Design a protein around this ligand. Sequence first.
Ligand SMILES: OC[C@H]1O[C@@H](O[C@H]2[C@H](O)[C@@H](O)[C@H](O[C@@H]3[C@@H](O)[C@@H](O)O[C@H](CO)[C@H]3O)O[C@@H]2CO)[C@H](O)[C@@H](O)[C@@H]1O
Ligand SMILES: [Ca+2]
Length: 258
Amino acid sequence: TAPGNEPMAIPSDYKLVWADEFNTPGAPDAKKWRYDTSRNKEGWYNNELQYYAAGRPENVRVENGNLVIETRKERLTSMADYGGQEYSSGKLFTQGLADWQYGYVEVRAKLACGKGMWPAIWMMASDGSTGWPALGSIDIMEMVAWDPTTIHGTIHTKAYNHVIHTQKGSRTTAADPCGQFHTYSLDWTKDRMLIGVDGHAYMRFDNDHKGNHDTWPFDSPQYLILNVAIGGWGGQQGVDAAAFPSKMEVDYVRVYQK
Ligand SMILES: OC[C@H]1O[C@@H](O[C@H]2[C@H](O)[C@@H](O)[C@H](O[C@@H]3[C@@H](O)[C@@H](O)O[C@H](CO)[C@H]3O)O[C@@H]2CO)[C@H](O)[C@@H](O)[C@@H]1O
Ligand SMILES: [Ca+2]
């Protein structure tokens, strides 16, 4: 629904304005990432099966220059916010720490595989007053590991979203995404978004320039989100116990702006 076919690359006139190179082993940098626990006890959206553990190295850690988000089959019943889940995982976002209006986002990542796994690199608007989906969401990368070579790039707005099946997205494939790094990229300007892998946009979404927040909510800042969900879209061919633990490794997040 949002086909692209054009190169993409860090614009020559942009500077690197924000980066997490995951240089510092241990916990993620608290000045860059917060943990999202907001629906642990209730159950996450999308019929998701994971508990997202905050402050827990087994799920979220920096090692050897990479962020590691790791899913595990386990019941974290000692957690006050435990929601009865069979799995643990990690969700980090830059909410309240850093956000961007326009820019080139480049994330170099090795994905988490195993039927059930749903790694994602995405964004939501800092101003959520209009609620989901109207606020505007940018999926720079989703993969569901029943189809682990397929890379999905999607935007959601009030007009264009998955609840009403009008989401603007595309897909491509990439070599062994769980075994080798690729670059997952967004080029967002006032005119359009390109979403790509390894310097190729497979997804394009234009600003129609109608000043309709329903079709272009993207003239306000967005923060970045990294997670690995379990089940929902990831669970289309079940959740494979033998797949755990599974990890997404992120070498870096770099954000460029004019
Ligand atoms: O169902 C209404 C509730 O929606 C909440 O928002 C969720 C939404 O339900 C869920 O579908 C969505 O899922 C994300 C995808 O749209 C896509 O953007 O990729 C993400 C990464 O895979 C995936 O999580 O997430 C929305 C935000 O959590 C509202 O938060 C809630 O107020 C509302 O009642
Ligand atoms: Ca690194």
